[model samples]
Target: SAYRHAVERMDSSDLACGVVLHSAPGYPAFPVRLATEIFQRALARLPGDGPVTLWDPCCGSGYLLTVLGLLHRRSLRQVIASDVDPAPLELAAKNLALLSPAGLTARELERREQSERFGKPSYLEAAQAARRLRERLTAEGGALPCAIRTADVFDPRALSAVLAGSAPDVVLTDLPYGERTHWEGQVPGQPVAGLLRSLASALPAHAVIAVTDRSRKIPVAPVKALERLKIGTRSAVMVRAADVLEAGP
Candidate 1:
């Protein structure tokens, strides 16, 4: 599969440590490697100095946000990870915790001692920070400095609320494939189109939305609707808003 090859390359480059297989098969969720790849590419297109924000609306297991956390390290202004279902959120939290352990213990012949204490390591600290950010977002009703919330793609009002609150530099999501998940009775031809259209309305000018799909015939109508939307199609289609203000040199 394409995912395996991508994972191998990422592992070789030392960008990711390991990939976890979600128990639910055939879902639109992304593997850690692919998530990392998308994030790196998006970050490459962003300005380094400005306050940058990232949003993963359908962030299953929050792997992409975790990758972003690791990539940005101390520089990330904020990251918001959200999912419709709570199961994956729990799992993502667990995965983040495992990646960011504060201490490690070893068992010896007699007594056990701390083999190592990992402090503020990029991966670990990022994970920890992500978890904390999520909590803060939930606790505070107002817009988060960086946070995730439960939302549905079908709800335009909910989408508007999030976007109106925080204008992000990038928006990343794995659209539901309509296999195991319920589509809420969407049309048979292509359910993704509608979701994309809805999301496009919320994006900032020049903001990037990265989506993954196996099919190539997906329409570019939604992207075309935006005067400034730039479309990039590799393994996935990246639609960027047109009104981006380039940083000064």
Candidate 2:
């Protein structure tokens, strides 16, 4: 258990669903331990680093990115959350904003008032969780600059265009399984494979992508899988653009 020590230090209750993070009905939360491991693994493979940019193309409620943004606040300059569906981006924006101290304060006060107004004990706890997370986020430096966008991963240029100026140093995404969050973009068979192909070409050469999917098979051509991750029912791969190795250092 390489991550046991680090994972042991984290408290899931702080970022628990129905608490500090805004959760959509169908969108499920990514496991905190797995997310941390994936980000660390991706960070390890990065070429050169000062502060890096992190992106999640199929961001859903942006729970994953928000947690990573807060945990790695000192190591990240910006966070980008994009989804083909705009429905969840609202929740995503709310979650990402919590990375900011001022934003957390605003939400905390709102939740505090809502607690008394509605007599919901959960609201009071949520406000307290936000306060604790805000203190830690402030200690880690401050908020991560975040952008929420609507983009189709199937479009080759969509990701590149969205990432125009601020190319991500690490891309961490959990692909939509065939269940609740299926692929909405227009793509041929096996959307995850297609998405991976598109991402391999769309991102900058220096970028490292760590994608987790519940697919049985992931196509290995056109992109090189640098590492493999098996967690629960899903499998993940840490990959880079094929040309990264072709282009000499």
Candidate 3:
């Protein structure tokens, strides 16, 4: 909700985490609005010092954290992203390049330019770059700390090796569903089941993990009463990691 709220804030506060990163076939992303809200809530439970540090093992083009970074670059520490496919990982890196105060302003300019190419003038992009956005970027002192990798989220070895020495405070993801996208080994339904089962052992303890899935059905899951809300055609359960684990049969 907070993520979508951020999207709402960028104009649709009074306009649009506020950037729409590149889109590719077979590798569609969780709506930035949806992902960020999930992320923010997960981060809310994160404990420690300094800015919030996060890792997403199934990151597709790094949309969620990148937008979060842009919004709170100064407050966020290191962000790590990974996926099984190198195709999406590289794209994630490329999108992550827009994490700085200067870079975001550049992207705003670019978004405006791209929309104009189709004659569909989205004033949001241009107005943001040319108008009030410049001031906000200056004020936030944005800086991007995105690190991406190619790894199997279900493999503990892969998770540990990829994360290296970083002890992430939060592990957040919008797991693959039977919607538009599907993973290599993923089954037709229950795409996220294995990931959910492996997570407790794969991830560092004490860290909060938030998952938003296609169906309200969650892992032998945690901390909240996982809510089933409409994410359009697919209804989802967006809940705290601990809440989910606690509720499972």
Candidate 4:
């Protein structure tokens, strides 16, 4: 039950099926559940006193963010997902649709073939089967409140505008690393100090950002580097919950 107070965790079989089937190589999940657990542990020191809103900017196929919604739905007040690729946005919507008012449903199951899906279901069929299943689950239940949008992570103005509307307590995103993990800017090397600075103005002063990547160091100025794990870099950045209230409801 200690994990109950910590970050949400999902094991092998639970993470497979719908999650793996959600995307292809370009949109690889790359063990989202495992990665997410680390992401949360790294960010556990963040202020959990107020509303916990999760935002994923480079949300490929909505795999990671949707997983957050599924595993941590009770605590998370809202989830904001965006990707430059309109395709992923659509798919993210489909997957997030499975988030019922309470939680997940029995229909979103294992290798067992689905019936009412848009097309035939199979492990190799993460895309279509996912869409078909989403339609049924979402239509039948009241899903969690999620805001899906189209935004480019590299563009400062656009990215700031995206967050200016609502300041989330926790900003979590997995940046693209290595080959095949392409992003909107595809900036090549790494996220510069300026990139973090650009995000600072947009992100809440008290916000704790967990930027998960292969080996990129978080160059952001405001945040105190909480922990650096072997898999990727994770840190806490500014997100002022008090400021949100100070700004008024």
Show the lowest summed lDDT stretch of 10 residues, model 1. Answer: 103-112
Highest-scoring model, TM-score: 2
Judge candidate 2 against the unseen true structure and give its global Cα lDDT, from 0 to 1: 0.77
Instruction: Give candidate 3 regions above 4 Å deviation.
Output: 1-20, 47-50, 105-138, 177-193, 221-249
Report lDDT (Cα) of residue 38, candidate 2. 83
Please give the ranking of all candidate structures by lDDT, highest first, separated by commas: 2, 3, 4, 1
Give the whole-model CA lDDT for all candidates, comma-separated: 0.49, 0.77, 0.57, 0.55
Among these predictions, the greatest lDDT belongs to: 2
In model 3, the worst 10-residue window by lDDT is: 9-18
Candidate 2 residue-wise lDDT, 147-249, digit = tens: 8889987787887667868877788987664322446422223565566667767677878878776654344444457877666666677777654345322
Q: Considering lDDT, which of the candidate structures 3 and 4 is the better prediction for this target?
A: 3
TM-score of each: 0.57, 0.86, 0.68, 0.65
In the range 1-249, model 1's lDDT, one tens digit per residue, is 243224454432222333221223323344456666666566556656465677877777665565555544444556767667776777555334422322110111001111124342443433434344434333433222345567776565678655547777777776544421245322223445555555656767657777654443334443442211222322455666552222111
TM-score of 1: 0.57
After the best TM-score superposition of candidate 3, give how far the Cα of residue 201 lies from its true spot, in angstroms. Answer: 3.1
